[PDB]
Amino acid sequence: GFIGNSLPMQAVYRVIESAASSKATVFITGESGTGKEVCAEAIHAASPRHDKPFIALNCAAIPKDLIESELFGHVKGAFTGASTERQGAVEMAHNGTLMLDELCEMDLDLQSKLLRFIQTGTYQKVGSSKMSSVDVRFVCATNRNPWEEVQEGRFREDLYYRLHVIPISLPPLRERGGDIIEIAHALLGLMSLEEGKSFSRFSEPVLRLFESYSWPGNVRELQNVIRNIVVLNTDDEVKLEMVPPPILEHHH
Ligand SMILES: CC(C)(C)COC(=O)CSc1n[nH]c(=O)[nH]c1=O
């Protein structure tokens, strides 16, 4: 679902294609704001299981005490807030692909349960001793340095070596050549649709700035910048005065 054919993304696309035909776990890393879910979905889409579900669990966007419920499900009354019975991500993903995003947010107890599940396919809903099984292809992702997490005792060593089979390091936006403006154009059209505007082009100074700035927040930061421009301005062309801070200030 990536845009562009920059040299470093070509390498990513070759690994996606080759990995897609295997069930081996993929382990994605990259700087803040790189497209980890886009990569995971591309692997699923290229795989023989593309017609089955792709499910992404963002472990950070769930309270830590509730990741297990989100992942494995829960029976009614399993814990104080369990108003009903819940199907876990692993069931939603059966015969498909499960992306565990921000995986290092899981506590060590949950990591142990995840490792059993990865080894066997077996799991239990929270609040239940009954065993179930599913078949999922795993893709993991993290913004942390997963090796560092292991060294500091926050991530299980056995889990790391079980998961770290096909690593993919996503290129940061500043290294992606012509992709930056191709992505910016796609965002410009989408945000214009969202906002009821009609931006269609960037001036030459804006192109130069977008192609020289370091984008420390990568594609998320680019999305913010295009959103800012389209929300605050009405024109067909993005002009340099429209670019928000601190893009220019930091650039210099
Ligand atoms: C406009 C569009 C929906 C394509 C934007 O999507 C995102 O920005 C997702 S993250 C991403 N998308 N495409 C890339 O080439 N690299 C990315 O990181």
Author numbering: 141 to 392
Quote the original article.
To characterize the mechanism of AzaU inhibition of LuxO, we crystallized V. angustum LuxO-C in the absence of ligands (apo), in the presence of ATP, and in the presence of AzaU. Indeed, consistent with this structural inference, ATPase assays using LuxO-C showed that AzaU inhibition is enhanced at lower ATP concentrations, as expected for a competitive inhibitor. Strikingly, AzaU binds the LuxO active site in a manner that mimics the R-C linker, with both AzaU and the R-C linker forming H-bonds with Arg 316 and Gln 363. All three protein structures are highly similar (rms deviation < 0.5 Å). Rather than forming closed rings, V. angustum LuxO monomers in the crystals form continuous helical arrays with six subunits per turn. We also observed the same helical arrays of LuxO monomers in crystal structures of the V. angustum C domain alone (LuxO-C), either as the apo-protein, with ATP bound, or with the inhibitor AzaU bound (discussed below). Our crystal structures do not reveal any substantial conformational changes associated with AzaU, CV-133, or ATP binding, possibly because of constraints imposed by the crystal lattice.
Here, we use X-ray crystallography to study LuxO, the central quorum sensing regulator in Vibrio cholerae and related bacteria. LuxO belongs to the subfamily of AAA+ ATPases known as bacterial enhancer-binding proteins (bEBPs). In LuxO, as in NtrC proteins, the phosphorylation of an aspartate located within the R-domain activates the C domain for ATP hydrolysis and the opening/activation of σ54-dependent promoters. Here, we present crystal structures and in vitro and in vivo functional studies of LuxO that together reveal what is, to our knowledge, an entirely novel mechanism of AAA+ protein regulation, in which a regulatory segment of the protein prevents substrate ATP binding and hydrolysis by occupying a portion of the enzyme active site.
